[PDB]
Design a protein around this ligand. Structure first.
Ligand code: ZN
Lengths: 291, 77
């Protein structure tokens, strides 16, 4: 019931499937999918992978879980969730994050562990998938593949400095000091036309305070691909990764990395006349995991 | 002032009539003097606590009204 618009994802069903996969994953399944059953271990394969990982996550206190998508392919009940994850990055990733938080708090509660749930529910957990299929290069990504998980490998040529990214504006009313904080949604900030107070109403009382806004890290990394396959007469191509938050300042120049993330496209403004955008979209990649 | 303290006749003063009407009058200082019999309370810091409480609600410097947009105020039944 209740699939989201423009997608094939149902929140309840996807959360159910992800919880099922978390509860009942054993590495022997991946061994079966790898046709490596002759290497099946009695110890590690028996033990529940992600439950244990969530445990050491709880004791250590980390907030990020790295998920192998081929493990999702291994589990029969979540084979469809794999394709749902490729085709719909952001929605399914948020679903996974909520499910991780739910599983953490549930596991604490069920065992009645002395560890307090104050930190757990306040924390924000992130899921970082990887090993999501093949590479296919960048010459072979058609525009229909916008906002999908892609796997890229190459050499990190150049790394820009840290670029602050606005998260909350801090407009201040000059007249009645009505300092409202505006969160950014879908990269848009909406100015109060007049003073949001009813008693005080002065449109010119607003003057954004740059310094008291809350920002977030953003680093652009120039990656030159080294695809496993190269078409005839194709010189190497450079793509612009865009990392966020903790991944900033992680990848140094000269590192040979394999990166997975969301293949995005953004209009580029023709600066000849302001607020006029070119019809050709620039393509870049948001980064979720770096190996 | 002039709590029967004019000591002279007046024509357009309620305090001039206060003697003839016997209607009681005190001063605000005398009001506190009589309140000493009653002794009514004036009202019916932790800077670190203030800061980690402003962790919630955001900063407290907002309009003292029924609107904050940080909370869905009830409108319907
Ligand atoms: Zn105002």
């Amino acid at each position: 019931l209740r699939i989201i618009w423009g997608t094939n994802v149902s929140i309840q069903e996807c959360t159910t499937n992800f919880r099922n996969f978390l509860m009942s994953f054993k590495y022997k399944f991946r061994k079966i999918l790898d046709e490596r059953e002759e290497f099946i271990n009695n110890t590690t394969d028996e033990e529940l992978y992600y439950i244990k990982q969530l445990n050491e996550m709880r004791e250590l206190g980390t907030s990020n879980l790295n998920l192998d998508a081929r493990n999702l392919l291994a589990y029969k009940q979540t084979e469809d969730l794999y394709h749902q994850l490729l085709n719909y990055p952001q929605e399914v990733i948020s679903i996974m994050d909520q499910t991780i938080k739910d599983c953490m708090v549930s596991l604490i509660v069920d065992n009645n562990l002395d560890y307090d749930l104050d930190e757990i529910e306040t924390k924000f957990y992130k899921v970082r998938p990887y090993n999501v299929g093949s590479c296919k290069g960048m010459r072979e990504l058609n525009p229909n593949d916008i906002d999908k998980l892609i796997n890229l490998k190459g050499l990190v040529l150049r790394s820009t400095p840290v670029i602050p990214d606005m998260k909350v504006a801090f407009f201040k009313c000059n007249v009645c000091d009505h300092t409202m904080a505006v969160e950014i949604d879908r990269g848009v900030i909406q100015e109060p036309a007049r003073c949001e107070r009813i008693d005080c109403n002065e449109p010119n009382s607003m003057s954004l305070i740059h310094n008291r806004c809350s920002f977030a890290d953003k680093q652009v990394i120039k990656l030159q691909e080294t695809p496993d396959f190269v078409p005839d007469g194709q010189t190497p191509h450079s793509i612009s990764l865009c990392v966020y938050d903790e991944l900033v300042d992680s990848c140094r120049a000269g590192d040979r990395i394999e990166v997975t993330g969301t293949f995005r496209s953004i209009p580029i403004r023709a600066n000849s006349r302001q607020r006029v955008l070119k019809s050709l979209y620039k393509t870049y990649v948001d980064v979720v995991h770096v190996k | 002032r002039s709590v029967e303290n004019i000591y002279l006749l007046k024509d357009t003063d309620i305090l001039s009539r206060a003697k003839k009407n016997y209607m009681k009058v005190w001063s605000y200082e005398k009001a506190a003097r009589f309140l000493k019999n009653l002794d009514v309370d004036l009202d019916h810091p932790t800077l670190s606590n203030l800061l980690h409480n402003e962790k919630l609600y955001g900063p407290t410097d907002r309009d003292p009204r029924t609107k904050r947009d940080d909370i869905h105020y009830f409108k319907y039944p």
